Paper text:
Many functions of [name] type IVa pili, including twitching motility and surface sensing, depend on dynamic cycles of filament assembly and disassembly powered by the cytoplasmic ATPases PilB, PilT, and [name]. Addition of pilin subunits from their reservoir in the cytoplasmic membrane to the growing filament is powered by the extension ATPase PilB via the platform protein PilC, while extraction of subunits from assembled filaments back into the membrane during retraction requires the ATPase PilT. [name] encodes a second retraction ATPase, [name], whose function is not clearly defined. Single-cell imaging using iSCAT microscopy confirmed that [name] mutants grown in liquid retract their pili in a PilT-dependent manner, suggesting that while not essential for filament disassembly, [name] may be needed to generate additional force when pili are tethered to a surface and thus under higher loads.
To uncover the unique role of [name] [name], we first determined its crystal structure. The structure was determined at 4.5 Å resolution, with four protomers in the asymmetric unit. While the overall domain organization and distinctive C3 symmetric hexameric architecture were clearly resolved, individual side chains could not be confidently modeled and were therefore not included. Based on our previous definitions of packing unit interfaces formed by adjacent protomers, the [name] C3 hexamer has alternating open (O) and closed (C) subunits, mirroring the C3-symmetric OCOCOC conformation of Geobacter metallireducens PilT. The OCOCOC conformation of [name] has been identified in PilT structures, while the assembly ATPase PilB adopts a C2-symmetric CCOCCO conformation. PilB has two N-terminal domains (N1D and N2D) that interact with regulatory ligands, while PilT and [name] have only a single N-terminal domain. Sequence comparisons between [name] and species-matched PilT homologs revealed a striking divergence within the final 60 residues of the C-terminus. While the first 30 of these C-terminal [name] residues remain structurally conserved, the last 30—typically absent in PilT—are predicted to be disordered by ESpritz and were unresolved in the crystal structure. Structural predictions suggest that these residues extend outward rather than integrating into the hexameric core, and recent Alphafold modeling studies suggested that this segment of [name] may stabilize its interaction with PilT. Our X-ray crystal structure of [name] showed a typical PilT-like hexameric ATPase architecture, captured in a C3 OCOCOC configuration. These data support the conclusion that it is a motor protein that assists PilT in pilus retraction under high loads, a hypothesis supported by recent studies showing that while [name] mutants can retract their pili, they generate reduced retraction forces compared to wild-type cells.
Author numbering:
A (entry chain D), C (entry chain D): 3 to 352
B (entry chain A): 2 to 351
The structure:
Amino acid sequence: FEKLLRLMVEKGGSDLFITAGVPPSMKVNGRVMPVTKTPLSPEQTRETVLGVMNEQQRRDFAENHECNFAISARGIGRFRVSAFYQRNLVGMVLRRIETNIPTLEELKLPEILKKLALTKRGLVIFVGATGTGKSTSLAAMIGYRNKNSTGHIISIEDPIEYIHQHQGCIVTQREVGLDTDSFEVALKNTLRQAPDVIMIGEVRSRETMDHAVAFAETGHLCLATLHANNANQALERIIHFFPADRHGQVWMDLSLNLKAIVAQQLVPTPDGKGRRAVIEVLLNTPLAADLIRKGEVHELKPLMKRSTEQGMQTFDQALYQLYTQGEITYEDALAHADSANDLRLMIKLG
Amino acid sequence: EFEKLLRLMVEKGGSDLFITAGVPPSMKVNGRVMPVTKTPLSPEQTRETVLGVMNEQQRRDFAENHECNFAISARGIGRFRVSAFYQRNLVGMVLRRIETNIPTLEELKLPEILKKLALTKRGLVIFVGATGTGKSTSLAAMIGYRNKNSTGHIISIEDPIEYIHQHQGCIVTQREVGLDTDSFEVALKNTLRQAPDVIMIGEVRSRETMDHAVAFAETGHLCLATLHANNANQALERIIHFFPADRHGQVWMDLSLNLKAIVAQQLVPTPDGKGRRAVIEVLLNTPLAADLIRKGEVHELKPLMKRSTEQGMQTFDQALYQLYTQGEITYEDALAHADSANDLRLMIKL
Amino acid sequence: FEKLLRLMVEKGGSDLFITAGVPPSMKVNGRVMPVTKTPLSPEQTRETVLGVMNEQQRRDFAENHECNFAISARGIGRFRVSAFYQRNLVGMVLRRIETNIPTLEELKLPEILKKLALTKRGLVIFVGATGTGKSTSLAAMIGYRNKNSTGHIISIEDPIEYIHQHQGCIVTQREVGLDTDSFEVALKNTLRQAPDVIMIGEVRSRETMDHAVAFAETGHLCLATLHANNANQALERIIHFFPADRHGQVWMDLSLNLKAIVAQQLVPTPDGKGRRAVIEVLLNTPLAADLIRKGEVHELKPLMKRSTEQGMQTFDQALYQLYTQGEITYEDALAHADSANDLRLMIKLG
């Protein structure tokens, strides 16, 4: 089993497949390819899947017919497993935890992210739908701060998607369910670990939101991801974490400590061989803070269209900057625009 | 060995010591993480060093909960608080040095109005300021003044405890959240039944903490607390936002009735660049100030503080004016730190 | 240990202090004074604090780091204890349960309370902030009915603040957590114990409110305390105990059985050596009952200003009656008034 893991790391496989009826196959560059010539038997698949679990994980797997966990192989790396029943037979899919962190330039992200990465204190939020590259761009941005500054970075992820090696800053990566019992317990102790930047993998409850706000008030850089399309809907979801009586405080605290909200979309390139990351940037200018303090989240979209000199940009302005660069077609810009008539008016204007 | 690393931190004045795998033993001296040795720590050495500080029971809680926060006492060196944690399935710990020497108000060169406030019998005193402006340092110095100049019981609820005051004229009960109490709210709820004469809340972060502080002052006890806000006006704005708008009318009335003073603190560098001086903005609850508080006219506070310097009040511009005339700050540092660079330039020229 | 309790009762100490680092000290007349000459060791403090708990209280104290309970010493009296961890060391504060009940005249309460104390059936509610003397004035009023009538008084408190000796009425004092499992269980059995007056220590839930309403319908005198500033806000909190569909019944039941709502404030005397109890009285006149039946709680404040002949009085009318008596200054009246302009108009009018 340990030999199959080294082959995946040496060959750069994205995912390993262990199920009955097919040989051990790995997805290398998106192509499922068999590793051996002999398919796995139901007994060998049941012996291989259960052999990776401990006594408690074997109990949860037999009761719930499913079990998702993570493992750490000494000297090889880490990988996330998704075990499952299939046709009343055991099966598991393993995903290698990547370590080669792309840079902000390799992702072709705007330069305002670099200034945000070197910020000393504040709250930065990565919004976007599922799989829009939020964690990918965040880890790329995390590598920028790790390489360009000195300090301590504390990470709480569920799961850890990228493992950053110790560069200029000390990097402590903790995964929920292995290194900590929950997000709340880790963030509660993150303050006493003398961090300089704290990255919450995802804010899913009000307790996670309170810790993120308290992190920024103490002069630390707080980063987190949340599932929302743009900056306006992200603020709407955050305020709904709290009862209405605490909204007045939430609007005031958000207007005081927030630094930026980065919304990310993935639009296909003209050649169809890849996807480009569209970034909507909202910087906390004094006018934006007043709109936040008043809860006038509706007034945010017009304000971002007039302050492009400070570093802000909507999705229509970012798509306008990418279509003029030739990185996206004309049809892809109008289909991905927040307003297909404004983007058509923005492109026709110059 | 380990005891030698503690003496080096005390002799070099390190704020925090870092013990984790992948990086050499590093200490945060003056906010800069610096390695102590040249050889990084191995996972076995980090696991042997972290577990070596725990007893048999702390090693059991650490293995079950993946986290363990505790405190230790080294004979002849001092005390330090540790925050152990799992990180990438590896052990790690951060140690924070606890300070036992409590300075005096004269050593901090604080205004004499603080001494009269320290000996007050009942009321609410609030320390405002940005992160690291010496709020807790000046408060502990003020706490040592009341502890040495009066008889009674002082109850302290901190997160964490930054200074440990020995029993002087008053009985000093220091309780830290997470070790001596489960939360700020639980400790303040029981603080009333412990017969205190002065109660110091480490920081007010919610409305429940604010309600207890108000109830503490109504019962004839001296209540002190810290909050993160630049000046007195913004501190009042943040406090009222803790509550829904329907309860604002009561909050303005209660604040106008029990409040004693609001002390805003700024740190300006001395002319020689070798240190920083604490600038103190003092707002005393005169009858005119109480009426402005009862009406919610927080905007009318800044002009009122400029005309009542005889009673003990002073703005940041008046305090910076008193320090620049003393030679404790340059002319450029006064205009850059002034709330109004034109008023301070007019105050100095007058 | 039993000798230290007798010394506190013989010397009239308000609170006894048992913590490491200081001798056993008692707060007599507000002055913390040491009893012995030798301070207590951590082992002696740990042996004294844990020695008062049973096996279960020692388990809750070790797990939660805090434990509040009550004890009964045969032949001495009762005292409430608040144990706590402090600097990872045990400590406890003991408060003596007072038995010398002040009378209504000693508290200088209005005579309408005497007529309310001798009432046969109905609901009387003591409102006020934390520590406004609600339980103190109630126990004083309880001693009036106990001494001036014959019957059975049933008390459910959490905790019992005053212990009334058997006078004209039979006095059964039950404390939650020692004499009963909960407020609901005690009130459920209070009906089958043939009472004539039932005092609920505090109404904190709807189940407690339902029992109080049912107590008054059965021809018994029901008294209870709740935390609210005045009569209007007390009614708002009571109706919010119930869903909106049951509000129509609650308004009708309140208009039918309620007798009075007594709001209490504590204003300092001119000499600054004490505090005087300000009492806002709202009597259930037919016009008030109609405003209650319609839910027009807003219409209550104007009605109380016009029916001073029946025994009602607002906070502004009571403060007007105390300022004319010389028991409060002119500045203390305008600062504590519900309307500083109406009280200024009430005082200027005569």
